[PDB]
């Protein structure tokens, strides 16, 4: 329900080590994190550009 841009990054149950971006509202910037490969939440982007376009300013 709340702004998905403010949710902490979600690695998920799968065990891959895929680098994705998430918007870090505390730092005011899109940062990288490890995504496991499945069950991604919305604050998970394939590029800094996608992250900024979607969550910039949150």
């Amino acid at each position: 329900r709340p702004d998905f841009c403010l949710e902490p990054p979600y690695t998920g149950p799968c065990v891959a080590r895929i680098i994705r971006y998430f918007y870090n509202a505390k730092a005011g910037l899109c940062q990288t994190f490890v995504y496991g490969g499945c069950r991604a939440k919305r604050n998970n982007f394939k590029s800094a550009e996608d992250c900024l376009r979607t969550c910039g300013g949150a």
């Binding site: 149950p13 065990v15 891959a16 080590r17 680098i19 496991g36 490969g37 499945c38 069950r39």
Partner: protein, 223 residues
């Protein structure tokens, strides 16, 4: 791999690393032109790295071959994770010879208690993050379907099996996905998912390869 040991350079010749600008998943070579991995490891521009030990340094026995085809199981369910298997065709045939070899597919499924070898370049810490340079190994037993379902209520399908130790401390972890679970020289599982790493009562979950042998053989032969 958490709680494992250094395998030793090229001691697991069928282990490959899937690279997309960095290591993100593992895989198992089953033929000079084909690799088996997990469906959730599907990515564009995959480069398969064979003959690897130190994943961060060129040691002289590596073969970097790009994927020409990455076929995810037609019934893979990205929500339940059922049918988490993928076949990758290599653009050129790999040169097999001691340090690079294929692993046999199973002729029958493995029973609970069967000791297996799980390997990968994934995180080695149950708390925190530390990625190894060299390949890590872990000996772990296949667990009963009953115990697997008890650990993960309503999440275990007929195409999944648990392996590891309920006490915790030994398990596969982020970066190991798609990698091998070999028992008695046969590829019985593919690193798929879990709950945290090496946590008590939360063993790793693996794709049950024995249920896909017919599909694997026919798919490889028709591509």
């Amino acid at each position: 791999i958490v709680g494992g040991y250094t395998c030793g350079a090229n001691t697991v010749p069928y282990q490959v690393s899937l690279n997309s600008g960095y290591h993100f998943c593992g895989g198992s070579l089953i033929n000079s032109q084909w690799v088996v991995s997990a469906a959730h490891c599907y990515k564009s521009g995959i480069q398969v790295r064979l003959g690897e030990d130190n994943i961060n340094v060129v040691e002289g026995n590596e073969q970097f071959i790009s994927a020409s085809k990455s076929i995810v199981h037609p019934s893979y369910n990205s929500n339940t994770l059922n049918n988490d298997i993928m076949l990758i065709k290599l653009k050129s045939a790999a040169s097999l010879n001691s340090r690079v070899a294929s692993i046999s597919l199973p002729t029958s499924c493995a029973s609970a208690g069967t000791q297996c070898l799980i390997s990968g370049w994934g995180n080695t810490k149950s708390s925190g993050t530390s990625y190894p340079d060299v390949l890590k190994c872990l000996k772990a037993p296949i667990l009963s379907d009953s115990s697997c379902k008890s650990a993960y209520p309503g999440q275990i399908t007929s195409n999944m099996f648990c392996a590891g130790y309920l006490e915790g401390g030994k398990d596969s972890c982020q970066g190991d996905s798609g990698g091998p679970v070999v028992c008695s020289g046969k590829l019985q599982g593919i690193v798929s998912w879990g709950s945290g790493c090496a946590q008590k009562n939360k063993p790793g979950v693996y794709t049950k390869v024995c249920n896909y042998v017919s599909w694997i053989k026919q798919t490889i032969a028709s591509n």
